[PDB]
Symmetry: D2
Subunit: 320 residues, 4 copies
């Protein structure tokens, strides 16, 4: 009773009576993630180092792989990449109805020191009948059909959230299959870890400043929270999902609108947190309700266990 | 030309005119690290999920692979594991002269959320003419013949430090060969990242507190440091070696002698840092000079780029 | 423009407007073949040999893997295995409409000396509405919906024939995907290799005896045919498919009805040869037209390039 | 306990008190065979089929991997390849004392239909005090220091024969390690399989003809032998070593000096057969005693179980 991702997606497409265009897209996504995972684990590196006698940095190659494999699903009309200034309009022969927003290799500062990196994606349905253009990507994350990420960590995991729930799949690289290892994931209501880059403590607003303080010096004299900040949003959000706690990347003054991008970092991760029973907020509003105006717009985000996120939203409220 | 770890170790053994007993040992570490890497990446997991009809949790397995493959080398007499209450004395039939101190899977809290984990090891030459015992492991780190670690991060890397210097080997998993990618590694003199678990801020001593303060609000008005703390010592020490900066786990009033263990976490990493041109101090003395009195003794450690560690030792001096 | 087997099967199921039950079955088949290929290449063998301190012969395990993965496709009601005396009736919860006939590891005498072995399968649609029983498997191969084989040779290849043609897919074991490498395969009209076990020359009928003779001593004094007989039907039929020539395993007197079994050796391979433009005959009739009476019935078979098979059928005719 | 090939070669080198130059060489063969095995199994093929948007045919690549990884050993002075018109003299900077004769990918006709293929090698110690030349390769096979082959069949196996005997190592591709699975291999005294290309029956001499006749129609009325002929010498010789029997490629009147080459096909396999207790004859003399006069010279060879080869030498004597 092994459920593979291939079996799971097809079963879901059949219960939903899709024409199979969305199933084709998700199957292409699973193929693109396995190919990236293999290049990230450095298979074939001996050839660069001349094992047979005698370039593509991993993020450019992860980008070429997601664009090609997704264009050949015949299921997308618009692609937005973290790595590309403009939205990619798929050629008419290869068009389908979906819009995919992705970060091809997340945790750019973490690539060379070999810490966990990952791929983040969100899928929208084209809501118009005109030529595909950037406009089709500019939808609130509330409109996502599916979103998720693949983590290339000690093992590779693909986490997929759709209307029905969040499920986690582990890649068995011996057979190239993702196996369902966690069905219907729900985040703990309260965690014990907070995750933020405190080197920006000087630019933090008073509510963040107050909340961190409370985590280190708890008023009630319970144990302080542990701190963890891997530096790759994928890696820090996955641990928040699996262990609980809170992850924050607020507006500071170098990034006054936050550093993380809305369509392919914040919205995918916000949708997974909400399908898992957590909250994802800007501090003032829910991330999935923002209507973007630029495909590379930034938003501050705080996401994680609902009691921890509620505790910080109450501090935001008493500072107005 | 492709220098594999097997070619490198055999040539270093030839230069040194060793009998070949330490080359057999280093070759046995290379095999155990490859077998742990494959298990960590979850190859064969489908069989656990019933793919063929019809769990040695990853740290017990890593522990069992290092002890067995190292007894089979005929090169060791005493083995000290993070996982083991007592020193393991190798049966006289497999007995050789080296003492191997190791942490088989570091970053215990990070195993389940799939963040980078790793193996740490230090090798001593047995010095007594007595029967092998715990005592042959209780040598200052200054007496280490070789030390290093394997990081199972986005790719698997082995870093080996011997008298000659520090060399980095990348595993090419397609051929099961460690390839020399970075020779005679030297840490940057000053970095821009500090790494510490700030959840313990209530229990830090005043030189640590003052130092974190200067990193966040620089008195000379230079730019603040970035913060990173993955939570696995191997991953944080490895990013410190490759990018620079400082890593700290001081005594807090929960772990008043520090948390990390001297024989198999602090001494191996101190020895690597020192052969790469950096420092490793308790804040009061050099880690490699401590005379161990217990195989599971703990020590504080501060390590990293020479200028950053020196800056903290200055602050430690204006407070005593 | 890579076509993977997953993309190809789904596209074909959509053009045919299947409910997706056949697509699910073929996706399970692709997962079962990858798992067998990995166990055949001996991944993990170091664990039998005690790498970590401390049974299922490859054909019993290949059998357990095909039965479990096919039962969990929820698409089969009857299974017939080379290795099982009785047909397997799938439990009602897991039932679907298809009947699958398979040889789990072909070339039993070739397993231990490591020569090419393979998996052979044929799929029928249940043509009745009564309880599944052996009767459902007893259909002429003319009724096959899909048939094919996976060869675990120097590389792993899956050859799949359905009404529309024969296509060959190569496993890239680095990502676990089968990639379409040969579309719409057609066998050469005449080949230059004959494949038969000549150690039975004493029991051969006069038409076989005459035909071999003509291959070694050609009347017209052209070049003799080369001989090849790997000993695994999969391996010998695949070379016949790809290079042309003829493969024969006639009735001799130890196997007076031939040695090869009809439902899971002869019919699958006969269907592939006919979709590829070749012939497969008993010598008297076409193999796919035999109506079987026992699920483990044997049939002689001669298959391959049509001019070569016609030349031997003309000799059969002048010996009556 | 797990004996890897790296552990075995290093201990044999220690027993023999070698300087370590032949251990470096055998370790370089183990690495080149792992890299050819991965290429043969087609890992990374998706990249050729455009998975990332945007061939060194397998024998050229195998050739380039053996020469490069062997020059990098600093252990060879002359290399003779099946693929190379002339002997390769290693640059004085990489020059050592051994002469390596090899066939990089044997079974050229079988590469495209994916039947077992393999690598064959023989190592001589250079004997002249002269500048290295073709001449140091022209030594009788009796002067070989080590010989063996790698078979890329259903699993990858390395068979190594040195003075001590023949040992078989299975590649565990999950960890990239060759594991000792069969120690001091001895061929059966009499087998029940004969292997020859009978398509040449018109050109065989009368002792071969008579011998095949006795195998098919036994005069003492014992059971006929089975016939097997894969078509790749490594695969057929390997099945002869493990099951027994006889392998023959006599001179036919197309190849009157035989087809297989003395330095890198016949001598390596003869040396393995002899260390396993079997025979290797041209029909007239022992293969290992022939004095080569050309690095690409051909010889007939008959090899296999002692009683079967002796039976054929008897027939060869009643005809001259
Ligand atoms: N594999 C899938 N699993 C989840 N829901 C899907 C699946 N396939 C399609 N559906 C649902 O059906 C809609 C249209 O399917 P489609 O015709 O394939 O584009 C999708 O946008 C989903 O809401
Ligand atoms: N492979 C090696 N590379 C580095 N130094 C080694 C090597 N092998 C041995 N040596 C040095 O020589 C000493 C004795 O070698 P051994 O006889 O093998 O125990 C060791 O303690 C090292 O200091
Ligand atoms: N993936 C497939 N490719 C080939 N034809 C198929 C495919 N799926 C289904 N069809 C055809 O449609 C019939 C019924 O499909 P199904 O409802 O899935 O059982 C099959 O028996 C085939 O003839
Ligand atoms: N690893 C080895 N195993 C078998 N015998 C070896 C080994 N290494 C060297 N010897 C023997 O010792 C000789 C000289 O060793 P070397 O100094 O390395 O060239 C060789 O020609 C072999 O006969
Ligand atoms: O160094 P800081 O400022 O903390 O930024 C890290 C954040 O930005 C991202 C976005 O791509 O990393 P990075 O810039 O290194 O590429 C996230 O993965 C991560 O959470
Ligand atoms: O949770 P904190 O207290 O920060 O401790 C993490 C430190 O301890 C160690 C030691 O084993 O991790 P862990 O307990 O999770 O196994 C180090 O890897 C790590 O640097
Ligand atoms: O030894 P012979 O009689 O030639 O039989 C081999 C034939 O039978 C099969 C059937 O399973 O092999 P085997 O008995 O060794 O298992 C075929 O793969 C093969 O073509
Ligand atoms: O076709 P025949 O004449 O039987 O020759 C096959 C023999 O020659 C060799 C020598 O290289 O194969 P091939 O030409 O196909 O490369 C051997 O592997 C094999 O045993
Ligand atoms: Zn990012
Ligand atoms: Zn640890
Ligand atoms: Zn069979
Ligand atoms: Zn050859």
């Amino acid at each position: 009773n092994i459920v593979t991702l291939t079996r799971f997606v097809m079963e879901q497409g059949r219960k939903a009576r899709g024409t199979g265009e969305m199933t084709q897209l998700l199957n292409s996504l699973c193929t693109a993630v396995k190919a990236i995972s293999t290049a990230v684990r450095k298979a074939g590196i001996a050839h660069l180092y001349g094992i047979a006698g005698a370039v593509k940095k991993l993020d450019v190659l992860s980008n070429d792989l997601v664009i090609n494999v997704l264009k050949s699903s015949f299921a997308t009309c618009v692609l937005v990449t973290e790595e590309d200034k403009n939205a990619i309009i798929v050629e008419p022969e290869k068009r389908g109805k979906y819009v995919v927003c992705f970060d091809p290799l997340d945790g750019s500062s973490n690539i060379d020191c070999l810490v966990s990196i990952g791929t983040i994606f969100g899928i929208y349905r084209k809501n118009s009948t005109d030529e595909p253009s950037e406009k089709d990507a500019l939808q609130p994350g509330r409109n996502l059909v599916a979103a998720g990420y693949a983590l290339y960590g000690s093992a590779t995991m693909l986490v997929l959230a759709m209307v029905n729930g969040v499920n986690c799949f582990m890649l068995d690289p011996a057979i190239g299959e993702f196996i369902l290892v966690d069905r219907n994931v729900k985040i703990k209501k309260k965690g014990s870890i907070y995750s933020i880059n405190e080197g920006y403590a000087k630019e933090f607003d008073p509510a963040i400043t107050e909340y961190i303080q409370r985590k280190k010096f708890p008023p009630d004299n319970s144990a302080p929270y542990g701190a963890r900040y891997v530096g790759s949003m994928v890696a820090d959000v996955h641990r928040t999902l699996v262990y609980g706690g809170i992850f924050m990347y607020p507006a500071n003054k170098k990034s006054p609108k936050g550093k993380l991008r809305l369509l392919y970092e914040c919205n995918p991760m916000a949708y997974v947190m909400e399908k898992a029973g957590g909250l994802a907020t800007t501090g003032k509003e829910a991330v999935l309700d923002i209507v973007p105006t630029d495909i590379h717009q930034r938003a501050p985000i705080i996401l994680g266990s609902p009691e921890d996120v509620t505790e910080l939203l109450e501090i935001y409220q008493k500072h107005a």
